[PDB]
């Protein structure tokens, strides 16, 4: 009289399959993009173009001298 | 199993997945979709078993 089936106390588990969160898509992405190269692009021409202007001081020590 | 019997075992209900077309990664997502029924073969079972003899 010693058997195992419990008179309640259950689930059950699902047999269901869902993972579907998005996701920031759809025209969100391709914008945040754009804006961060051409937030790189503005961090350019104020470098490269600061460093010309150095470029240009650093010749001019030599045309000062060499007669 | 469901177009014969074998023995208590017409007494459970669950479904038997299909594929579309004829290749292996649709005969690949039958493997992954039985092991989400043989859960529920299992759990209708837990309910069912009467006490008695072996």
């Known amino acids: 009289k010693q058997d195992m089936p419990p008179v309640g106390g259950y689930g059950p588990i699902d047999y269901k399959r869902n993972l579907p969160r998005r996701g920031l898509s759809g025209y969100s992405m391709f914008a945040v993009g754009i804006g961060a190269l051409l937030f790189g692009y503005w961090s350019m021409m104020k470098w490269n173009r600061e460093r010309r202007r150095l470029q240009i001081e650093d010749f001019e020590a030599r045309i000062a001298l060499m007669p | 199993r469901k177009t014969q019997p074998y023995d208590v075992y017409d ?25 989400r029924q043989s859960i529920r073969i299992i759990s209708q079972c837990l309910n069912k078993m009467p006490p008695g003899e072996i």
């Open chain 2, 11 to 35: 007494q459970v209900e669950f479904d038997v997945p299909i594929g579309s077309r004829g290749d292996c990664y649709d005969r690949y997502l039958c493997r992954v979709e039985e092991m």
